[PDB]
Design a protein around this nucleic acid. Structure first.
Lengths: 149, 126, 119, 102, 52, 87, 50
RNA sequence: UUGACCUCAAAUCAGGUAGGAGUACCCGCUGAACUUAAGCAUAUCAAUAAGCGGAGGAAAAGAAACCAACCGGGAUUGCCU
RNA sequence: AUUGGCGAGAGACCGAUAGCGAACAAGUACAGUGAUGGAAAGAUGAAAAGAACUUUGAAAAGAGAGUGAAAAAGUACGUGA
RNA sequence: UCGAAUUUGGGUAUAGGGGCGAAAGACUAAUCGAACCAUCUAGUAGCUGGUUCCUGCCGAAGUUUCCCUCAGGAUAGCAGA
RNA sequence: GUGGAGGUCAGUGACGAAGCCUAGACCGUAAGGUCGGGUCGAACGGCCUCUAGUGCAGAUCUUGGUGGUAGUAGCAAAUAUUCAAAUGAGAACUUUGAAGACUGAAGUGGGGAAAGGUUCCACGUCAACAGCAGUUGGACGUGGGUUAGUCGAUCCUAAGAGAUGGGGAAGCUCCGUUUCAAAGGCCUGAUUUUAUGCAGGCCACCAUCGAAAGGGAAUCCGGUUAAGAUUCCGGAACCUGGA
RNA sequence: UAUCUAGCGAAACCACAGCCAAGGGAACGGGCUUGGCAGAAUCAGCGGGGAAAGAAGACCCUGUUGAGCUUGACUCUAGUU
RNA sequence: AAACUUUCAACAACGGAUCUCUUGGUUCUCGCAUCGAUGAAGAACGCAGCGAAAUGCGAUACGUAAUGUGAAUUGCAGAAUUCCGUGAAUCAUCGAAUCUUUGAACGCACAUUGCGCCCCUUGGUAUUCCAGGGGGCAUGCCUGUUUGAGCGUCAUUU
């Protein structure tokens, strides 16, 4: 039980773990199915970029505050400063977040210039009349990469 | 190769589908090639076999023997032909079972569904 | 061969029921000839010929019930569509497409827009 | 709600609330709906409960008493029971092994 | 299969019956009755170290 | 006298036919079926009886109605008839 | 039992009609695996058990 | 006397609906013991097996009475950590 | 998420004491009062062409003949320790 | 022993830590100081038995100390690589 | 060395692969490999490497099979058989007759209950079974047989079981059977289907199951079949319900 | 009955089998050693031997194996106050 | 010397291993959601010319209708210009039906093919009785209808 100069190995297998082994043989199968789900999603909602536009937010805690990342959605103040209704921003592919608040100017400035670039780069198809021949850019995240400040 | 994923290259599933095929599936499994003159006359290569077709046996021990079909025996995947039999020891004449892929059809039994099958496969009906 | 349903459907109720009574009579006479003969496969033809007739009798009577109850609420449960119990308890297409006036105002004023990035 | 939902198996238990108590009994007025009544199947504010997943919701813990008693709340106080204590127990006791082992 | 060799309710007879201590199928009158099971050495039992 | 002389008095019937599962399992004095739980509403079945579930599950019998639901779902539970008369 | 129920008599009538050997033309059919009646029951060998 | 209202009935009233099966997965309740601790009682097994109730193609959860202490993030779920 | 159902495709899997209990009229025969327990049993040949007929024997069957490439394939049937 | 604390049929009731016992721990379906069936369960065992091809080379220990330890372990020693 | 995999020998093979047998050879210290002969009939090897459910003499091992014992023990309770004829290939056993016997009316008889299920009876038949035998059979194969107003069940209640109402229980379900229940089932008259009313009015009743031996409407005689009889037929009755 | 014959026809057991004396040896050998001896195949008995067979000794001991029962052993607990 | 005992070979037996196959299993992946009071799963019993199972089915009973293919099924018999056809088949498909007795089982009951009741209709002189046929009769709960109950309570009416 305790033999030789060996480290104490805390192996947690005294339950009935063999009833609950999940082995991911479907890792290749799910990747094909996820790409097929993305392909049939883009076929459903063509020509929108299959994901909403996410803000450049600052990561919490002192370990990760040196790096910015993607937020859930823009704030109400950010969308209003860009000059569009938050309900209208939801319809044109901008994710908007109602609980995140604005207390940092350069994060606010980076997010509103992201919104200015998004409104300049997309067009809104008219409700009536012939929609223009517009190609679909499949990745809005690859269209707007997040740069460090 | 095998590109469409709906069809299988499993030997077991292919053999199961063959032996447990119903009579409608067995009709097209029991297809026979036409002769050289029937290929020149109708423009098709092979055709599912009927009960009134003049056939010629081109393989086996019955090679070089013509005949007319007596009964398409779809249960044994065989066809039984007239005047090509086996003389049993008690004087009887039992029909020799033949797979239609070893036979060559010399004359057709052209009904209107048979004729409509000819232009369905792309024939000219000469 | 026996009787066929396409020319059985050209008849009214009277001669069809008379032929049903008749076809039962050759069925019974074939059953008493079954006891003397060693084989009689003609009883299968009459048995299916009977079965053709009262299928047609049931089909004309049920279609008369459809024409009687046409275009009115509360069709009978045997005379309405038996899809699946869970589908019959489920909401219909109209009631599932119901929304309130508040969500209808939101959908009309702000519909899901069509947009594209020009790269 | 469980005993009422067994009595009215044709109705969906919406909610319940305390009305009275004594030494021996606690009294609860339990709100139920008719999911096959046309006033509930129409008027789409309330037609979510005739959806076939909401039947016998009081026997699964979907009502507010069940949501309390299952410990389903957001917080660090509810780490065992976030999406169900058995869902977390499966998630934390499965040995998830991959094709290329980590 | 993880139930292979274990869709069986064999119980050992113990000693005192002049047969080996292996689990044997109870009941009676079927040919399978009294037959050893639940072991790698037994016909119809599970393999040693079932492949996972 | 607990064996062969006592097997001659073994001539009553503790169990008779059940009207639900058809086994000789309906206890006469208890008025209940030991195998299917007749006349209670639930068919008696247990997860410790994995083989007992296997003997009486769906698919052991005819499936007079359930064998057509797979075909009826595959075509979409439609009504009516195929309309074209003949080729 | 000489005074039985109709259910018992109905079970006996099923078992009486079942108690017969294989028809000889079953052996003559193609790809036949059946050699004999394995469910054949005699009263001196196996009881029906009601 | 006659009309109500409130409550409680009844009807083979009109229209509906629930049961039961399956149960691999899911939502709860209930709930052990073998085992291990070289004994064994807390502990472990295990908030598991059995039992019971209830659904669906998923279920559950789900738009914070949250996490955090950061230049703060931002429904729920799942995976790597 | 999914060891059930339906359908499909695969395998450095097993190959008839193995693989599901069950390749076969398998939850079947059979056993137990009962809950329950629960087998064994695949392959002639390409095709029955499954041995017409003669003889001995009551018959089974044998010996000839004959079919078949082979009867050192005769349904007690691949090979046959 | 044989006219009743008799015998016996059928119906009925009592079910497992329970029943029933003119009391033997007797009987409870050939099972009884805790029935049978299935599951947890492939429970655990310092204890017994077995542990499947060849050749080459090297090659022991039954002793220190500790342990509810004395049929076993750990540690040091001997031994191989 | 075995099962399988990736290569390769443009490897071997119906002119015979794998298998199996071989007091027949060769090689290897050996594990084993190779060849020849016989059988066989459809796939299989060498080398490099990978992979494993990989090598058996033992586990009172598992499954299947076969021995010695061994043509052995045994086929020794129920007093007991013998002769002829017939059938038949064949008679200790079948059938009939003649004897002799036995059970000796709390019988080895005639009926039935529980139980069994077609064993009853006929015809054909003896591959297996009958502790020997078999022409026989409760066996095998094909058929035929069970007739009820009166016999029973059905109806009633016993000891009891068991729903409903209701009360517990997380529940499966448990109690309770008249309980803290609004528990109906018949009387009527407008005109012999007649009011779905005051009316020639009431027990305050409590579902239901429970006995083929208890309670109980009413059938006896004679004949009849290969096998049915209080059932069929002939005769003679009786009860219930109705008009 | 056993015995013999006709028919039918097992099992227990079985490393291999089967003559002893003495010696030694795990201290009571059928086999080893040294002697005696030893001639096919048998039948019926018989109970000296095969430490004959029938059961992983039931007596005893060990187990950090249980179980039944008991109590002013420990710790709890239904009930009741 | 033979018999017997032992060993080996050949051939024949017993037995079914090895080898070869494989309409089966196991595992993995993918796709879908689809039982039931409009009566489910399950059971019992019947149905084929000759079937005991398996499979299929339900007195329309190895099925009927509709559609498609187009000439079989087959072990034998029988039918088969039903065949240039609204047309065979143990065919496929399946959208209309039937669907015995049951079973959550639902009139009550059930170790009984028991005992009932209501409506319409036919027959026996028939509103009552006996039959035949058809259709019903469970419990809980919701909404509405109708009939009610309660000095619970209000107004009005001598």
């Amino acid at each position: 039980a305790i033999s030789k100069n060996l480290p104490i190995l805390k192996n947690h297998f005294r339950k009935h773990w063999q009833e609950r082994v999940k082995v991911h043989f479907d890792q290749a199968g799910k990747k094909v199915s996820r790409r097929n789900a993305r392909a049939t999603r883009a076929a459903k909602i063509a020509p929108r970029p299959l994901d909403l536009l996410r803000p450049v937010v600052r990561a919490p805690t002192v370990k990760y505050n040196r790096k910015v990342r993607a937020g859930r959605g823009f704030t109400l103040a950010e969308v209003k400063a860009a000059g569009l209704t938050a309900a209208y921003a939801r319809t044109i592919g901008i994710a908007v977040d109602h609980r995140r608040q604005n207390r940092n100017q350069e994060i606010f400035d980076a997010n509103v210039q992201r919104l200015k670039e998004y409104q300049s780069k997309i067009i809104v198809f008219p409700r009536n009349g012939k929609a223009p021949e517009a190609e679909q850019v499949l990745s809005a995240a690859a269209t707007f990469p997040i740069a460090q400040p | 190769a095998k590109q469409s994923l709906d069809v299988s290259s499993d030997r077991r599933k292919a053999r199961k589908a063959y032996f447990t095929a119903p009579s409608s599936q067995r009709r097209v499994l029991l297809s026979a090639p036409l002769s050289k003159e029937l290929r020149a006359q109708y423009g098709i290569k092979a055709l599912p076999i009927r009960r009134d077709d003049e056939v010629l046996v081109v393989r086996g021990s019955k090679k070089g023997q013509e005949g007319k079909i007596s009964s398409v025996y779809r249960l044994k995947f065989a066809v039984q032909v007239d005047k090509v039999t086996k003389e049993k020891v008690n004087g009887a004449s039992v029909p020799i079972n033949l797979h239609p892929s070893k036979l060559v059809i010399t004359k057709l039994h052209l009904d209107k569904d048979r004729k409509a099958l000819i232009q369905r496969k792309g024939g000219k009906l000469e | 061969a026996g009787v066929k349903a396409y020319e059985l459907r050209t008849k009214s109720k009277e001669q069809l029921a008379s032929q049903l009574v008749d076809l039962k009579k050759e069925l019974a006479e074939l059953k008493v000839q079954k006891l003397s003969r060693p084989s009689l496969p003609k009883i299968k033809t009459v048995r299916k010929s009977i079965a053709c007739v009262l299928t047609v009798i049931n089909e004309q009577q049920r279609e008369a019930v459809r024409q009687l109850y046409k275009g009115k609420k509360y069709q009978p449960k045997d005379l309405r569509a038996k899809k699946t119990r869970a589908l019959r308890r489920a909401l219909t297409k109209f009631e599932a497409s119901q929304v309130t006036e508040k969500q209808r105002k939101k959908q009309i004023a702000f519909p899901q827009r069509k947009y594209a990035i020009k790269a | 709600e469980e005993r009422v939902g067994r009595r009215a198996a044709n109705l969906r238990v919406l909610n319940s609330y305390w009305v009275n108590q004594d030494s021996t009994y606690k009294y609860f007025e339990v709100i139920l709906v008719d999911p096959q009544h046309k006033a509930i199947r129409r008027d789409a504010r309330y037609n979510w409960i005739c959806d076939p997943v909401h039947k016998h919701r009081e026997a699964r813990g979907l009502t507010a008493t069940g949501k309390k008693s299952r410990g389903i709340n957001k917080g660090h106080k509810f780490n065992n029971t976030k999406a169900g204590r058995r869902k977390t127990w499966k998630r934390q006791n499965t040995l998830s092994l991959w094709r290329y082992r980590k | 299969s993880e139930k292979a060799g274990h869709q069986t309710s064999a119980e050992s007879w113990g000693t005192g019956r002049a047969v080996a201590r292996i689990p044997r199928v109870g009941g009676g009158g079927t040919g399978r009755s009294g037959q050893g099971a639940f072991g790698n050495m037994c016909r119809g039992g599970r393999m040693f170290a079932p492949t996972k | 006298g607990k064996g062969t002389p006592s097997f001659g008095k073994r001539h009553n019937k503790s169990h008779t036919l059940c009207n639900r599962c058809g086994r000789r399992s309906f206890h006469v004095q208890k008025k209940t079926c030991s195998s299917c739980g007749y006349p209670a509403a639930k068919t008696r079945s247990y997860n410790w009886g994995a083989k007992a579930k296997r003997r009486h599950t769906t698919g052991t019998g005819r499936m007079r109605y359930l064998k057509h639901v797979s075909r009826r779902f595959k075509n979409g539970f439609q009504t009516g008839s195929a309309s074209k008369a003949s080729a | 039992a000489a005074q039985k129920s109709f259910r018992i008599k109905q079970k006996m009538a099923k078992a009486k009609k079942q108690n017969r050997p294989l028809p000889q033309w079953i052996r003559l059919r193609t790809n036949n695996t059946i050699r004999y009646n394995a469910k054949r029951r005699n009263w001196r060998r196996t009881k029906m058990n009601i």
